[PDB]
Amino acid sequence: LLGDFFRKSKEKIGKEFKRIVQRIKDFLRNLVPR
Amino acid sequence: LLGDFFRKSKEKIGKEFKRIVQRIKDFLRNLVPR
Numbered sequence: 001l002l003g004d005f006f007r008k009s010k011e012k013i014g015k016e017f018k019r020i021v022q023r024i025k026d027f028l029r030n031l032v033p034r
Numbered sequence: 035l036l037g038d039f040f041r042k043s044k045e046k047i048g049k050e051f052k053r054i055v056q057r058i059k060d061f062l063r064n065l066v067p068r
């Protein structure tokens with residue numbers, strides 16, 4: 001986002017967000033399986 | 035945001051975001067001091 005500034009912070013944030021999205025995906029796959 | 039889910043991730047994200055905002059603040063204070 002902010003150009004090439006805050007590489008480290010932006011990568012940590014992206015990490016956690018991907019973790020969250022993955023767990024929400026797992027949950028929805030258990031809610032409506034297939 | 036997502037209720038009480040993802041306490042740990044949400045806290046890490048908040049940490050990094052506050053770091054970023056603080057550094058941007060410092061920068062703007064050097065750009066227009068007072």
Ligand SMILES: CCCCCCCCCCCC[N+](C)(C)[O-]
Pocket residue numbers: 004005006007008057058061
């Ligand atoms: C108007 C917003 C200005 C954003 C520029 C802030 C520059 C701060 C530089 C901190 C260093 C970040 N770095 C390169 C380690 O990622």
Ligand SMILES: CCCCCCCCCCCC[N+](C)(C)[O-]
Pocket residue numbers: 001010011013014015051054
């Ligand atoms: C203050 C908002 C922070 C935004 C966080 C953006 C996370 C990007 C994670 C790495 C992936 C970015 N990339 C390389 C696809 O552009």
Ligand SMILES: CCCCCCCCCCCC[N+](C)(C)[O-]
Pocket residue numbers: 013014017
């Ligand atoms: C609000 C937290 C940060 C949001 C970051 C969103 C990044 C979405 C994933 C980037 C897509 C990269 N990909 C794999 C298509 O190349």
Ligand SMILES: CCCCCCCCCCCC[N+](C)(C)[O-]
Pocket residue numbers: 023024027038039040041042
């Ligand atoms: C429609 C979105 C549904 C979101 C609910 C996902 C539940 C996943 C539970 C993972 C556990 C999270 N916890 C409690 C450790 O923070």
Ligand SMILES: CCCCCCCCCCCC[N+](C)(C)[O-]
Pocket residue numbers: 017020035044045047048049
């Ligand atoms: C996927 C988006 C993540 C949103 C991150 C929200 C960070 C909140 C940081 C802790 C502060 C929240 N609080 C307690 C003021 O509500």
Ligand SMILES: CCCCCCCCCCCC[N+](C)(C)[O-]
Pocket residue numbers: 047048051
């Ligand atoms: C996109 C990354 C997450 C953004 C989190 C934004 C939180 C702003 C700070 C919350 C304000 C809490 N306070 C100190 C007024 O009580």
